[PDB]
Amino acid sequence: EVCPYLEETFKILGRSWNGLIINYLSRCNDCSAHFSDMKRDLKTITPRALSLKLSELAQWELVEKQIISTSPVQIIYVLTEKGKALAEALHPIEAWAQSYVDLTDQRT
Amino acid sequence: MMEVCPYLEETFKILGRSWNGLIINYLSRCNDCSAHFSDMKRDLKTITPRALSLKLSELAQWELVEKQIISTSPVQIIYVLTEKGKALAEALHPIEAWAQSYVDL
DNA sequence: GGTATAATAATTATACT
DNA sequence: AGTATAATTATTATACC
Numbered sequence: 612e613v614c615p616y617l618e619e620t621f622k623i624l625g626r627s628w629n630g631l632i633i634n635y636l637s638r639c640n641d642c643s644a645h646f647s648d649m650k651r652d653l654k655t656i657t658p659r660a661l662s663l664k665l666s667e668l669a670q671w672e673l674v675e676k677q678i679i680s681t682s683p684v685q686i687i688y689v690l691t692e693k694g695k696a697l698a699e700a701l702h703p704i705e706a707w708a709q710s711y712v713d714l715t716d717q718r719t
Numbered sequence: 720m721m722e723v724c725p726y727l728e729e730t731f732k733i734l735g736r737s738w739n740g741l742i743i744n745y746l747s748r749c750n751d752c753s754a755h756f757s758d759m760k761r762d763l764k765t766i767t768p769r770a771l772s773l774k775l776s777e778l779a780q781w782e783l784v785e786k787q788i789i790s791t792s793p794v795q796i797i798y799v800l801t802e803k804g805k806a807l808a809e810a811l812h813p814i815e816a817w818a819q820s821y822v823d824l
Numbered sequence: 825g826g827t828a829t830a831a832t833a834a835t836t837a838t839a840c841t
Numbered sequence: 842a843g844t845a846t847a848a849t850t851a852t853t854a855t856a857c858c
Contacts, residue, residue: 612762613745616818621740624814627835630731635723644721646842652721657836658843686842693821700813704734707810708726711803718780737834737852756825767853768826796825827857834851840844 623671628656628664630701633673633690637698642690643677649688673697733781738766738774740811743783743800747808752800759798783807 623629635649636642650661665688668674673694679685690698733739745762746752754762760771775798778784783804789795800808 613741613764614815614818616822616824617744617815618741619822619824620814620818621737625735625737625740627735630735631723631728634727635721639721648721650842652723654723655836657838659837659845660835662843663835696821697814697817700817703810703813704730705724705727707806708724708730711806712726712729714725714729760825767855769828769854770852772826773852825858829856830854832851832853834849836849837847839846841842 623667623673628653628660629668630704632661632664632668633694633698634701634705636674636688636690637695642695642698643687645685645687668694733777733783736777738763738770739778742774742778743804743808744811744815746784746798746800747805749800752805753797755795755797778804 631653632649635652636644639648646658646661646665649665650656650658653661656664665674665676669676672691675689675691677687677689679687741763742759745759746754749758756768756771756775759775760766760768763771766774775784775786779786782801785799785801787797787799789797
C-alpha cells in the first residue's frame with residue numbers, strides 16, 4: 612500500500628505546471644527568473660495560471676518570491692534548496708521522456 | 720530564450736494530473752505489475768470508481784497500463800504495467816526519496 | 825467491476841492595466 | 842508584473858447494479 616509522502620508530493624507534482632516551473636527555474640542562472648521570463652519560455656501558460664502556481668509553490672516553500680531593492684524594484688522567483696533538490700529528482704523523468712515519448716502520437 | 724523540453728512537457732500531461740503517478744507506482748509494486756480494479760480502488764483509499772476508470776483509460780491511451788481480458792471461466796479483467804510503464808515507475812524513485820527527506824507530515 | 829448523473833474544484837480565455 | 846470576469850475541464854460525490 613501507498614507511501615503518504617509520495618501521495619503528498621503529487622499534490623503539487625500531480626497538478627498543472629508545477630513540475631515544469633520548478634524544472635525551468637532549476638535551469639536558470641542562480642535558479643532565478645522574473646514573471647515575464649517564465650511566461651515567455653513556458654509558451655502556453657496564462658498570467659493568471661503562472662501567478663497562482665508561483666503562490667502555491669511559495670506556500671510549499673519550493674519557490675521564493677524576492678523583492679530586490681534596485682531602481683526600479685525587481686521581483687524574482689528563486690528555487691529554494693528544497694525546490695532545487697526536487698528538480699534534481701526529475702532528471703530521470705526527463706531521461707524517460709526522451710527515450711519513450713513520441714510527439715507524433717495521437718490519443719483521444 | 721531558455722526553452723522547455725517538449726518531451727518533458729508531454730510527460731507532465733500524464734504525471735501533472737491527479738492519480739496517474741500514484742497508479743503507476745502502485746502497479747509497479749504489485750506481483751507481475753498487475754492488479755484488478757477493486758485492488759486499486761481499495762488500496763488507493765480515497766479514489767472514486769469513476770476517477771479510477773477514467774484514469775485507467777487515460778493510462779491505456781498512453782500505453783502505460785494495458786487492460787487485459789483473461790477469458791477464464793468467469794472472465795478476469797487485469798490492468799498491467801507495460802515495459803514503458805515500468806520504466807516510468809523506476810524513474811519516479813528519486814522523487815519518492817526526495818519526499819522522504821523533505822515532506823512533512 | 826464498473827456506469828449515470830450531478831456538483832465541485834482546477835485550469836484556461838480574454839481583456840486590461 | 843501582474844489582476845478581473847467568465848468559461849471550460851478535470852475531478853469528485855453520490856447512487857446504482
